[model samples]
Target chain A: VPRGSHMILIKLGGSVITDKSEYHKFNKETVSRLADEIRRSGQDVMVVHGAGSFGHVIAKKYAIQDGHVDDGQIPAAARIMCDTRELSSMVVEELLAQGIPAVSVAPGSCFVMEDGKLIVDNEEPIRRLADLGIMPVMFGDVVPDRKKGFAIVSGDQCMEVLCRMFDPEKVVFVSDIDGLYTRLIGEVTRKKLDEALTDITVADVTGGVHSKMEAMLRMTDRNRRCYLVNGNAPNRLYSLLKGETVTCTVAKGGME
Target chain B: MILIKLGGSVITDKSEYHKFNKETVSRLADEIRRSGQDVMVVHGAGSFGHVIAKKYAIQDGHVDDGQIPAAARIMCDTRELSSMVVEELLAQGIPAVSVAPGSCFVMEDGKLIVDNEEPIRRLADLGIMPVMFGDVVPDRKKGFAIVSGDQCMEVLCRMFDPEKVVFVSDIDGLYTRLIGEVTRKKLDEALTDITVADVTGGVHSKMEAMLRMTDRNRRCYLVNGNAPNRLYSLLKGETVTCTVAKG
Candidate 1:
């Protein structure tokens, strides 16, 4: 109940928030379960969620792959930005509903991007909020670019920036599937998860294996840690955050 | 202490809704930076609001079964705009922090009944200015309604009672046409004989509520916010072109 001293950053993938195939759909059950895990952890956290249907659906329509190409896509960019915040708000609403003191921060509102790199103006407000025991929630957003007119910035990049700025103890990636499968669990090649596996899923528009792992290790050393957990599995996050090893993969780097 | 409510139209492009008037916003922010007084900033969601609130029908503090996306969309737009305002304030050397209403306030029977005002007071007490804006909130009676900057200003004035209140807009002050279209009988404010512009374009309903809430108590001035030195004069308690409401 007192302010948590140990801090960590979390990224809830868009795939986990909604059915990627379904339009405007929300996974409330999964969201509630994750909220339960966070509540049970009793550790300080800053949550960043991917823009699943809320963003991808609209961003794809706008064709803002590399940056703002046409001026006409500005409306599309606004829609994308608004949609992402809507999803982030919903995430905060769920966390609050479960009795967590959470506040949602729109990243694009504060970030200005040059090329694909994001520049955050300040971090003290977010830092102070966490120190006061309230969770700061952020999401992927559409931001104005110096190079391009506007572009989409993923939660992964934002998460990495915050981590590098504040230096949390650990970073966790929660996704729909189990951690790092060499092959399908049904195939004979799926005997082991090769615990030190460097690559997992292929890099997609949102984010994939390399980017997620690299962002988590922004300033990691041996004392700090990184985790890859399947959010679909209940209580896994609680166990891991509680310092007990769960059936997930620990990204090994910063060789100590 | 000064409470400043920046008009959406003055800070943002109204004709092309959803576009931010960076030049105006930056200039006004520079003026606030120049004034260097203890201030709390609240702004209107110019183009970002009118079109979206209309497209989704969320201006009334109520959300129906049909507009879940609309409610979400409305919240998103407001945050984006609020984010823009806070960023501008920060860039201008004001330690401005974004304080969202829906995250803390709730409505019962279309009125703000449940609110957590402690942290905001704490922030202001610590010499950090809190910035908030109009937002769509879930209502017990209607589901959701738009809490405008004027409404936020009234609530803030009641809680803090700043030395003066400033309403920033494109026009000089309150024209008879501004409130006449909404309520000819209920409208009672000191006005000039100049017919300038419709400053209260879409904030009609809330304008009536705004008038009833704060009046005949403190010094409230409406001035052209786009003018840099004008804002500085108003913030410094000097004379400026505008309507003076005897609030």
Candidate 2:
């Protein structure tokens, strides 16, 4: 906890990068702008992104999340690795095009997980790349699991591991929707936000939003400051990275 | 002095861009481990580079506005290949460290023109094997170019002047003798054809690159990696059924 040290964990949501309903398409404009904003924020930052159309569509079909694909389904497994590589490559391209020192780290090449814990340790390579002053970017990918044959490691999982290992100052989640809310986030006006009186439910039942909340709560146990913000707003994420106050869902405390 | 170059096809399944030949690579790592020689490893891009380079039309080595994404794919794919190589090598108890060409390679006029050789020598001295592969790198002549594994081995030979250079591939040797001779006369591409060779033209082009890589008065051998005892014998400078490049 040095006074002058400034570091942050930025997770670019899959919804923000790629069109959720569409296949193999990304919002290139939003990605490009965010890259520039991120570079302006600081030199030392680690970025992890989720699997959008590139990952989940195939993952959903193959039941890759359950990680029980047999040896016969191996060909299908190859597709998962390539699709994620495609997405992460595009993200790195946008970052590199903006003159950011971004390098893509292929995840499964180094991962060997055993029972919800990483055994072979994928972090050393990321650590080496980061220690060399290059921006290390990783994303959700299919990894060889001891528990199951293969499991889809989410971007949130990567964020949790990174936060535990490097211990950055804050973790930021920028999504397509607004921050977490009592009801629908977008419908909650200023005055209604104060009421924690009603039951909470979610509409993003494609299963991404709920998992994100679940992961963020796991992160808050170790991290003091974790924010889920609206990437659609723009400049708010940049502002938060600079240690400025912003209106977002504070995972640790009750209010932002 | 003891250096080895593993062809991309031998190390990986080239038909698929990201599929690695784990069994072959692991066995090769075990073979390399048993050698008891501090060797420097060079490999090709194979499936990784060929796919991206063709898609980008990057043979002439120029980067344009539209080809930026292709360049990005090439940059990332090569790392995946080399990273896999290092990971396998480490798993087999070989002290292998990857030296990324795109990061450290400085090119001038379509050729390597920088010094990252000292760090490699230091690693070799420390009993660690240094591994590098062909990659799409930024160039002085063109904005980016694909630096092949052969080109890298050649550069390393000039810099370190190793004892012997071993080229391992699926083929038995440059002048591998046939038992009863069913060799064909007409030819297609020696470089492109995988299972068969035009024998003369294909084998000549292969040896030419090896000869081009070394003038350092060191021995060079083209041994069949798939053949059983050739690699061990090749490293020891014992006679094997492989061709020796002349200066």
Model 2, range B1-247, lDDT digits (tens) per residue? 6778998878778777778888777777777777776677898888886886897786676646556556656667776677678767767766565555664554566576544244455445444455668876566666666777877887877777777888888876655352211122211223355576555545545555666654546656766777775677667666777766655
lDDT of 1 by residue, A46-105 (tens): 788888777687678778757656655654555455466557767876786676756676
Give per-residue CA lDDT, model 2, range A130-235, as digits (tens): 5434466767877666667666677877777777777776778888766774354432222233342343455544445444454565555433567787787888
The DockQ of predicted model 1 stands at: 0.05
Instruction: Report the number of the highest-DockQ candidate.
Output: 2
Fraction of native contacts in model 1? 0.02
Worst 10 residues of 1 chain A by lDDT: A184-193
Residue B227: error of model 1 in Å? 28
After superposition, the stretches of candidate 1 with alpha carbons farther than 4 Å from their true spots are A1-5, A183-219, A253-256, B1-247
* A-chain TM-score, model 1: 0.83
- Docking band of candidate 1: incorrect
Residue A41, model 1: Cα distance from true site in angstroms: 1.6
Residue runs of model 2 more than 4 Å from their true location after superposition: A1-4, A117-122, A183-217, A221-223, A253-256, B1-247
